[model samples]
Each structure stands twice: as C-alpha cells, then as structure tokens.
Target: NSNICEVCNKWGRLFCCDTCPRSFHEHCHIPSVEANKNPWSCIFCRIKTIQERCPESQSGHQESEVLMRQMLPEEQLKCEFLLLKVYCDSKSCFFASEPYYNREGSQGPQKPMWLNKVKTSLNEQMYTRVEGFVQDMRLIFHNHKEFYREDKFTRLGIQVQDIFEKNFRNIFAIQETS
Candidate 1:
C-alpha cells in the first residue's frame, strides 16, 4: 500500500499491490479496468517484475527476441565468439551424433584436434538448439541462472555450425595472423 498517488504523488484514494506493500493512487494506477480492483501492482513493483504474466498483455516468448535484439553490436560479436569457443572446446560432443557425422557403418571419421581439422565423419549432427538452428542464441542469453532456471528466456544454452563457423573462424584468423 502506498501513502501517495503514483500519478501526482499527492494524498488521495490509493490502490496498492496485493502481492506486496507497494500502493498507488486510484487515478495513477492506469492498468486498473475498474475502481477498487482487488489485485493491482504499483508502477514501482511492475518494472522489477520478470513478467511471468503480462497482465492483460501477451507474453509467451516476448523476452526471447529482446534478449538478442537489445544487445549492442560488440556484445553480439562477443556472444558469437563465445558460441564458437564452446563448439571448439567440444566439437566431438557436438558432432558425435549420427545426423551430424558425414559417414556411416564402419568408416566413421575421427574427431579433429583443431578447429577446422575435421574433414570427414560418420554421422550428421542435425539437431537445432532452439529453432531454425539459432546460432548460440540460448547460451548467449543464458545469464543469471536464477532467471534462466525459471525459463524466462530461451532456456539458455545450437547446431548449424555453417552459419557461425565461417564468420567465427575468420574472426580468429585475423588474430592468429597478427
């Protein structure tokens, strides 16, 4: 319950957050469809909310796109770099599956020791991490596991290495040559 109106900060008929003690004036609570609503959230508490439910608004995966879309260009590059880093560190684990391998039966390709060394393989790892083979989108946004544990974003954690392999390898090539 608030002591002042959220709109004018003046003493008046106020509505408060039923979930918490935060309260606001009647006119200030814009979301209220009617007077003396039983449940209401003051402006202060709403901003800090992760929005499990967006009141009368739609949600579902609204937070997913914003996670990547909001990142700065440099941050996006850093995230892409991390994706490649994870793949390089664990390429065997990624391509060990049948769909990702390039061969079948008894002639499986040996896992490579270098980033680009894998010329042949037995299987094809064809699963996408999220959808449309999002390139490290989940891992890039997997921050504050507390938030992730809740599944607020894309369940933070890819396939389709082709989309990332060339560009990410080029980024490293520049550094290696230098």
Candidate 2:
C-alpha cells in the first residue's frame, strides 16, 4: 500500500516491492533499482547487489585504460581511491538478524580472554572493513555500524538519486541491465 514516489508525490504502475510486496516503486524506493531503475524482481536485485558488494568484486573496474575515458590516470586513480571507501563491512549488515549474539541478548559485552580476544577480533574486523570493496559509481559505503544504523546511507543515496534525476534524468534513459 506504500507504492509512492515520496519525491514526485505520484504513484503509478509501481506497486509494493517485487519480493516482499511491502509497497514501493520498481524504481524509486528500491535500492537495486536505485542503482539503475528497472522493472525487475527484488530477488534478482538482491543477488546482483550481493555480487557487486563482495569484498573483491570490482566488476565495474579494470586495468587503466585510455586517459580520455578519464581525465588522467592519476585523477582516475585518485577517484578510485576516493570511491572505493564505500561498502565498509557486511558483518554489521543486520538484515532481519539478531542484534546481539551473547546468551544474555546484549550486543555490548567483553568476551573472556581465555575464550578469545575481543579486542583482536574487533581490530581485525576494522582492518578488513577499512579496506573493503565498492562500486566505481558509488561515492562511498558506510563502513561502520553506527553510520549504517543511523540510515545515513539511505539518506545520502536518496539525495544523490534526487540530484541525478534533477540534473541528468533527461540526459539518459535508465536501462536496467541483468
């Protein structure tokens, strides 16, 4: 029942999410379609998203090509470095998952040194996350649970899509690719 553009303030052929049917546009509210708005199933979108979000899946990247495709190799490298900062850590991606793993149902707790080193595990997680993977198109992925929990990525992603629609929506047709 929630299939509305929220921005355009209009509703049409779009109906609830393709998978869950909770109400959303095929293009607007869905993240999979947000990357490239298309009339497709949410399951496919979810799979594609996972594939792209993997730690080493640079599907959109390749070796340095002609300088014309990009301004300069150095500039492109810099941009890559800047853009690669997204997709922080999936360990914190709580999608219908429990908040806490402890028997007491609390997430915040110190594990005994005898069992394992919590500090070391956390440090290792940070190391993996700080250097995680990302798409060439996205600006950055929230690497921290705090940032993700606050829905900062959702807000920022919407802002970006809005800006793109406002400025470049007419420039190209959004063709959803499989």
Number of the top TM-score candidate: 1
Candidate 1's C-alpha runs over 4 A off are: 32-37, 51-178
- Worst-scoring 10-residue span by lDDT in model 2: 111-120
- What digit string (tens of lDDT, one per residue) describes model 2 on residues 70-95? 33333323222222111122221221
- Superposed model 2: Cα runs more than 4 Å off: 6-9, 20-53, 58-178
Prediction 1 global C-alpha lDDT: 0.35
Q: What tens digits encode model 1's per-residue C-alpha lDDT throughout 1-178? A: 5686544457766666777775555433433324555675543344335233333222233324423443343323333343333343333243322323232232322322222221111012232222212332232222222223443332222232443544443432222322
> What TM-score does each of the candidates earn?
0.25, 0.21
RMSD of each: 21.3, 17.1
Please list all clashing residue pairs in model 2, or write none if there are none: 16-23, 16-24, 86-141, 87-141
